[PDB]
Amino acid sequence: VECDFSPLLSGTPPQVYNFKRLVFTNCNYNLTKLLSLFSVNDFTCSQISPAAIASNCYSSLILDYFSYPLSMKSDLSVSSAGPISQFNYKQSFSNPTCLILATVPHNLTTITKPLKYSYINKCSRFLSDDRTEVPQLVNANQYSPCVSIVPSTVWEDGDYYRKQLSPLEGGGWLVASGSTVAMTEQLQMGFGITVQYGTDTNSVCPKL
Ligand SMILES: *[C@@H]1O[C@H](CO)[C@@H](O)[C@H](O)[C@H]1NC(C)=O
Ligand SMILES: *[C@@H]1O[C@H](CO)[C@@H](O)[C@H](O)[C@H]1NC(C)=O
């Protein structure tokens, strides 16, 4: 009857384009209890507040978490053309959402570091003319089209990934490039929260 955030605290977190997603229904949560394990560097919301998201009742609550460098903050903003919002991670524009940037302290030994930070810097599609390039932007609540060809961790910065599509998928080529950022002194993470408001189904409530 309590929301289990355990898989977030055990093992190596994934990369922004392989964000691990936890779904929560019919349970109770202590959100300030979870954030206290971390040094919270950034906390921004949309159509909700950081105070409201901790003290409200939802039909459902979605939690996305990945490894993400604090340096790359502006790339998460939909205002920017940054490769993260375009090709890696996008939260729903319809529902209330929250994005949290935090650092995992040395005490939290159960969370292990990746070798580095990885992200997709370009993901596009070449039309049959083989001259025109159509960017393949990531949709809300979905992974990127290029996740199938981009590895869990990019081996070297500037690596290219291509795939010849079948007429089923439309023909043409699928192109992706990878980029790396050097691992920080302390692992930095990104947490994306999405909540749904129902009518008679608001089962997810704060632990009191
Ligand atoms: C545990 O965290 C505290 C900060 O709350 C820190 O001062 C301490 O060094 C950590 N424990 C160890 C064994 O480093
Ligand atoms: C559980 O949530 C309450 C708010 O409802 C918070 O004040 C408290 O600190 C949380 N529990 C712990 C052990 O921190």
Residue numbers in the entry: 381 to 588
Which lines from the publication concern this structure?
Middle East respiratory syndrome coronavirus (MERS-CoV) has emerged as a highly fatal cause of severe acute respiratory infection. We developed an alternative vaccine regimen, based on full-length S DNA and a truncated S1 subunit glycoprotein, to elicit a broad repertoire of antibodies with diverse mechanisms of viral neutralization, and found that immunization with these constructs protected non-human primates (NHPs) from severe lung disease after intratracheal challenge with MERS-CoV. The England1 strain (GenBank ID: AFY13307) was chosen on the basis of the availability of its sequence and its proximity to a consensus among published sequences, particularly within the RBD. The final round of hybridoma screening generated 45 subclones, four of which (D12, F11, G2 and G4) were selected for additional characterization on the basis of their binding specificity and neutralization potency.
(d,e) Crystal structure of MERS England1 RBD and effect of critical RBD mutations on binding. RBD residues 506 and 509, identified by mutagenesis analysis, are highlighted in green. Critical RBD residues 532, 535 and 536, identified by structural definition and viral resistance evolution, reduce or eliminate D12 binding (shown in red). ELISA results show that this set of mutations eliminate F11 or D12 binding. Although it also targets the RBD, F11 neutralizes MERS-CoV by a different mechanism than D12. Site-directed mutagenesis and competition-binding studies indicate that F11 makes contact with the RBD on the opposing side of the binding site of D12, at and around residue 509. Binding studies also show that both D12 and F11 can bind to the RBD at the same time, suggesting the potential for additive neutralization effects.
